[PDB]
Write an enzyme that holds these catalytic residues in place. Structure first.
Site, short mmCIF file in Angstrom:
data_model
loop_
_atom_site.label_atom_id
_atom_site.label_comp_id
_atom_site.label_asym_id
_atom_site.label_seq_id
_atom_site.Cartn_x
_atom_site.Cartn_y
_atom_site.Cartn_z
N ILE A 13 0.85 -1.18 0.00
CA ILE A 13 0.00 0.00 0.00
C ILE A 13 0.89 1.23 0.00
O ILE A 13 0.66 2.19 -0.73
CB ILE A 13 -0.81 0.06 1.30
CG1 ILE A 13 -1.98 -0.90 1.37
CG2 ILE A 13 -1.23 1.49 1.60
CD1 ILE A 13 -2.77 -0.74 2.66
N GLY A 16 5.55 3.43 5.88
CA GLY A 16 5.22 4.24 7.04
C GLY A 16 6.42 4.35 7.98
O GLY A 16 7.57 4.28 7.54
N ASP A 127 0.87 15.40 13.71
CA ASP A 127 1.34 15.25 12.34
C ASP A 127 0.19 15.22 11.35
O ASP A 127 0.21 14.40 10.43
CB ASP A 127 2.22 14.02 12.16
CG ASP A 127 3.11 14.09 10.93
OD1 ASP A 127 3.37 15.21 10.43
OD2 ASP A 127 3.54 13.02 10.50
#
Lengths: 297, 268
Positions: A13, A16, A127
């Site tokens: 996907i 991270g 964030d």
């Protein structure tokens, strides 16, 4: 609660805090999930410690659900609910149409709901940016990526200074303020609000000083009147150029009076006067809000 | 202003009052522990205090660590020889949760005088995370205290320091303090500090916020006042020593009041 055997890996996907995120499918229930994998030298990383412990408590339709945590051998897997796209990718897919105003409004209202929930549960996100906001095909948007998040106390203590992706960072952080609170997240949402309207970052700075000067060039250089204390903040400099505040209608020209009113209260210099997520929900801007599905696949 | 989150303080307080019940250790876990005692735990907590002083850690990290230990000790039997490993892993997790700059694992290994290996600490870390199902955001006496202080008229740093001192003392003594919730100990400590320093008592304001009255607080007050009077003679000294420091306005040097003069308000 679960095991990795019942998950079928589908495709990468993204990438991270822990390396790659993978789309997978639970072969028994049919549920599609996202897997973050954390290879377990300094033990479990503090980022994961916070992400997992804060997400466990934050059950809300506008925060991505941590479904499970699986501890296999020398490895830890986070199972999240799957969301098709992030907001950045959708803003870019929306180039020729813009995001329709119904969607900007639906998405902002949802973001505000999600954040108010965070704040009511003593969590700062720290964030917020389009890349960390996930959208599904049903019209939901959800706060994701809680690795830079923190459980706060009342009143707040000094926390980490290296917080918030630069484009989205509140001025009190750039000015090295001893204390920062929930207004830093509102600032982020303000930037994102403007960004949904124009499809481009409101303050795309190239450095901390550049970021601060772009903000100042748009909202005006703050003085003691607008923001009492500013001239005494650790990273304030008397030699800062003094730019005049520009017609705020000129900051986001297509936005109407309500949108402008709201945006201005999100990007208020003084963190004491900046609107709260909770109060923003009642803004007249949202009087007609609905939650339509995205207009694009 | 926003640093004291006017729009969320009430919601935050309601949430911590519910989470303190959910994060509550079992009051009678030490009886079911075959090989460890209140005294052992007292030594351990006293040591963590010094670890915290040595590494200049937050007080919040200390309170989080004690919470983890007590919750861990509620479900897991531990031999006396491994109590310190439990506490080290606890403090490591606390630090990573709560600190901007946590000490390294190696630092933690070193403060155990090489009693345990680094592999042991990291394994215990994982064990602790599994037993607590990662529920690490537990409310502390601190989280309540800092809120209570907002009701001081006016603000007074001796009151603030004295309250933390008393709140810390209670960590050392599972008996009696396991009996009491964080929000209650904070309230007792806050009152006791206020009374010692200014002569004043629990404010109606905090009555409204908490629903606690001096009557509610009495049992915890009676206990906490005794701990203050006996503090000089306790086998554990690390907290009083810590609170001699100017950083905490030398409050451990203040004399405890002889009596509390806690009375009943008729028809209020």
């Amino acid at each position: 609660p679960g095991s990795m055997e019942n998950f079928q890996k589908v495709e990468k996907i993204g990438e991270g805090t822990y390396g790659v995120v993978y789309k997978a499918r639970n072969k028994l229930t049919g549920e599609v999930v996202a897997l973050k994998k954390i290879r377990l030298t300094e033990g479990v990383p503090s980022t994961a410690i916070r992400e997992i412990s804060l997400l466990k408590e934050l059950n809300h339709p506008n925060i991505v659900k941590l479904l499970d945590v699986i501890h296999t051998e020398n490895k830890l897997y986070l199972v999240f609910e799957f969301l098709h796209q992030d907001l950045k990718k959708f803003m870019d897919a929306s180039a020729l149409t813009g995001i329709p105003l119904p969607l900007i409004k639906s998405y902002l209202f949802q973001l505000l709901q999600g954040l108010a929930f965070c704040h009511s549960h003593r969590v700062l996100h720290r964030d917020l940016k389009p890349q960390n906001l996930l959208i599904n095909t049903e019209g939901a948007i959800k706060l994701a990526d809680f690795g830079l998040a923190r459980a706060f106390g009342v009143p707040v203590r000094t926390y980490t200074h290296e917080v918030v992706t630069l484009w989205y960072r509140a001025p009190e952080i750039l000015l090295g303020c001893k204390y920062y609170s929930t207004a830093v997240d509102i600032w982020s949402l303000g930037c994102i609000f403007a960004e949904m309207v124009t499809r481009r970052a409101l303050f795309p700075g190239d450095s901390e000083i550049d970021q601060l000067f772009r903000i100042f060039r748009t909202l005006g250089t703050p003085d003691e009147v607008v923001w009492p204390g500013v001239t005494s903040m650790p990273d304030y400099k008397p030699s800062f150029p003094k730019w005049a505040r520009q017609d705020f209608s000129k900051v986001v020209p297509p936005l109407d009076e309500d949108g402008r009113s709201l945006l201005s209260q999100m990007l208020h210099y003084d963190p004491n006067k900046r609107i709260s997520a909770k109060a923003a929900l009642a803004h007249p801007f949202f009087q007609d809000v609905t939650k339509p599905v995205p207009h694009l696949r | 202003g926003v640093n004291e989150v006017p729009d969320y303080h009430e919601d935050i307080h309601t949430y911590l009052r519910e989470m303190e019940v959910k994060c509550k250790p079992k009051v009678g876990y030490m009886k079911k522990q075959p090989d460890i005692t209140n005294s052992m735990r007292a030594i351990l907590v006293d040591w963590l205090v010094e670890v915290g002083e040595e590494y200049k850690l937050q007080n919040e990290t200390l309170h989080l660590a004690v919470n983890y230990i007590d919750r861990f000790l509620s479900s897991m039997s531990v031999l006396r020889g491994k109590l310190q490993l439990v506490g080290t892993a606890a403090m490591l997790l606390a630090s990573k949760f709560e600190e901007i700059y946590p000490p390294e694992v190696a630092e933690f290994v070193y403060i155990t005088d090489d009693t345990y290996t680094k592999k042991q600490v990291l394994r215990m870390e994982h064990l602790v995370l599994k037993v607590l199902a990662f529920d690490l955001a537990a409310p502390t006496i601190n989280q309540f205290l800092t809120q209570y202080f907002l009701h001081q008229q006016p603000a007074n740093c001796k009151v603030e320091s004295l309250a933390m001192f008393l709140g810390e003392l209670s960590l050392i003594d599972a008996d009696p303090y396991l009996k009491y919730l964080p929000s209650v100990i904070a309230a007792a400590a806050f009152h006791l500090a206020l009374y010692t320093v200014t002569g004043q008592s629990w404010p109606e304001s905090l009555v409204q916020k908490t629903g606690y009255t001096l009557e509610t607080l009495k049992p915890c007050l009676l206990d906490l006042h005794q701990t203050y009077l006996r503090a000089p003679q306790h086998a554990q000294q690390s907290i009083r020593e810590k609170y001699k420091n100017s950083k905490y306005h030398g409050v451990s040097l203040l004399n405890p009041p002889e009596t509390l003069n806690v009375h009943h308000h008729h028809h209020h």
